[PDB]
């Protein structure tokens, strides 16, 4: 279960085909893609869940069906959303799509009819759902929540399996592959945590390095980190994080500190760095994609020795706040949800080219 996909150098990024599709909704917060006919699912603060056919890389995402929630659904076990949907994940088997958000509910819908087949409450008055991730090739779902807990589920049992404890702030983002494990990030706790579910153990990785101290040890020959916001797993032994100081860090499970750091990865604009608001490592490959609100999607390549990563290129048609990135293949198709606002309501001054919809990029070789 390690990195074996080396197509980073092959990618024809400079000649990528770019498109954008407007939606009549406000503020996409997440996008989830299904891969065996390929599908995408989008959720919005406007309480809309939408399904797209994305199998034809020649044409933009084709809208198939939608379901909108609303005030009607105030109780929390009703089969509809009544507060901001923050996250969406498509089940690996093609049968289910599950949503969650500020109304402290998981709602699992059938992909067939886009109808709610099960509603599973978190049962906590602070348990907002912030992020979802299925174990790959499984029905095991992991939901990171705002009450500092990660909840696990068996989706074809429609039940809650257990609860994981460790974080000391909201668990903003969570990533999982094929193993029965997951990575989470705790925002202001400035930790990433690796949960080995069957071993009942957990690794803890710490950021939040004092700049004066960093400068002090750099003189042996920058920007304050206040939150680690995003995370993505590249293989069963490595992962990447993104912070609100622009840092993209590569971590190995064996090391306490990051094995590599690219500081202010999306630049600045006395000095303020662009946050990393999106991060997706395509599983077991040497490429990952990063997003902010700086107007482009940065594609990076990891070294074959896994000790560094480097800038492959930029996808510059991606104006707006990138809230989520997914990658599908047949040819790579990058899909990214673009909003005028940050998923969680963090305040963003002047977003250039603010807009609502889905960015698509098709890359060859």
């Amino acid at each position: 279960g390690r990195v074996f996909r080396y197509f980073g150098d092959k990618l024809l990024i400079s000649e990528a085909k770019q498109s954008f599709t407007r939606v009549g909704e406000n503020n996409l917060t997440c996008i989830s893609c299904f891969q065996p006919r390929l599908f995408a699912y989008t959720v919005s603060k406007d309480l809309q869940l939408t399904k797209y056919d994305i199998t034809d890389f020649s044409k933009r995402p084709k809208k198939l069906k939608y379901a909108k929630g609303g005030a009607k659904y105030i109780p929390n076990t009703t089969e509809g959303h009544y507060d901001e949907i923050l996250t969406v994940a498509a089940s690996p088997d093609g049968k289910y799509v599950v949503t969650g958000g500020r109304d402290r509910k998981l709602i699992v819908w059938s992909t067939e009819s886009l109808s709610p087949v099960k509603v599973i409450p978190t049962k906590d008055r602070r348990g907002e759902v912030l992020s979802l991730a299925f174990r790959k090739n499984s029905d095991q779902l992991y939901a990171s929540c705002a009450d500092f807990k990660i909840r696990t589920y068996s989706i074809n049992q429609f039940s809650q399996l257990e609860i994981l404890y460790g974080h000391h702030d909201i668990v903003e983002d969570i990533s999982a592959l094929a193993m029965e494990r997951c990575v989470t990030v705790g925002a202001r706790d400035r930790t990433a945590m690796l949960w080995k579910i069957p071993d009942e153990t957990r690794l803890t990785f710490r950021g939040g390095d004092e700049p004066q101290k960093l400068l002090r040890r750099w003189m042996k020959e920058f920007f304050c980190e206040g939150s680690i916001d995003v995370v993505s797993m590249v293989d069963d032994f490595h992962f990447i994080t993104g912070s609100d100081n622009g840092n993209i860090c590569l971590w190995s499970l064996a090391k306490k500190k990051p094995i590599f750091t690219e500081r202010i990865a999306h630049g600045i604009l006395l000095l303020q760095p662009f946050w990393i608001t999106s991060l997706y490592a395509i599983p077991y490959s040497n490429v990952f994609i990063s997003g902010s609100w700086s107007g482009s999607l940065k594609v990076w390549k990891i070294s074959d020795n896994l000790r560094s990563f480097e800038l492959l290129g930029e996808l510059s048609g991606a104006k707006g706040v990138v809230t989520k990135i997914q990658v599908v293949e047949s040819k790579f198709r990058i899909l990214a949800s673009i909003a005028k606002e940050h998923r969680l309501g963090r305040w963003i001054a002047n977003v250039s080219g603010a807009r609502n919809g889905i960015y698509s990029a098709v890359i060859d070789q």
Side-chain angles (χ1 to χ4, degrees), residues 222-223 243-248 262-269 271-276 290-296 298 300 311 314:
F222 250 73
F223 288 95
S243 297
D244 68 335
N245 73 335
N247 288 13
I248 295 181
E262 180 77 57
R263 317 200 151 254
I264 62 188
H266 272 262
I268 64 273
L269 179 79
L271 296 321
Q272 285 278 64
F274 275 102
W275 312 343
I276 316 290
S290 81
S292 197
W293 70 95
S294 62
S296 74
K298 292 222 187 170
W300 310 80
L311 190 45
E314 296 190 28

Side-chain angles (χ1 to χ4, degrees), residues 252-272:
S252 161
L253 273 52
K255 263 57 176 295
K256 203 88 262 293
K257 290 317 206 82
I259 189 183
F260 184 77
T261 297
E262 180 77 57
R263 317 200 151 254
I264 62 188
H266 272 262
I268 64 273
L269 179 79
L270 278 200
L271 296 321
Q272 285 278 64

Side-chain angles (χ1 to χ4, degrees), residues 5 39 58 88 126 158 165 200 213 218 228 303 322 354:
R5 255 108 116 12
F39 300 113
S58 155
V88 60
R126 227 70 77 199
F158 309 101
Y165 313 81
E200 212 179 343
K213 208 67 161 284
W218 183 88
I228 305 171
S303 303
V322 188

Side-chain angles (χ1 to χ4, degrees), residues 138-183:
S138 163
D139 81 307
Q140 298 177 296
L141 179 74
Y142 310 138
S144 64
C145 303
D147 60 342
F148 307 177
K149 331 272 212 293
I150 286 94
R151 295 170 169 90
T152 75
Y153 301 89
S154 199
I155 290 300
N156 60 49
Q157 281 191 327
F158 309 101
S159 76
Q160 184 168 319
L161 291 173
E162 71 171 306
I163 309 196
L164 309 173
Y165 313 81
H167 280 298
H168 296 314
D169 193 15
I170 65 179
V171 199
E172 257 194 281
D173 204 9
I174 185 170
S175 206
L177 295 178
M179 280 201 78
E180 200 178 345
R181 66 176 51 167
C182 58
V183 261

Side-chain angles (χ1 to χ4, degrees), residues 268-292:
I268 64 273
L269 179 79
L270 278 200
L271 296 321
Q272 285 278 64
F274 275 102
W275 312 343
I276 316 290
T277 58
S278 248
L279 203 58
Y280 183 84
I282 125 108
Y284 305 108
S285 83
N286 69 331
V287 59
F288 63 85
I289 314 157
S290 81
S292 197

Side-chain angles (χ1 to χ4, degrees), residues 29 45 84 86 102 129-130 170 172 341-346:
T29 56
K45 303 185 177 178
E84 312 198 328
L86 299 182
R102 311 200 112 101
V129 187
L130 268 38
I170 65 179
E172 257 194 281
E341 302 176 359
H342 186 258
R343 291 175 50 220
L344 304 191
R346 284 294 286 154

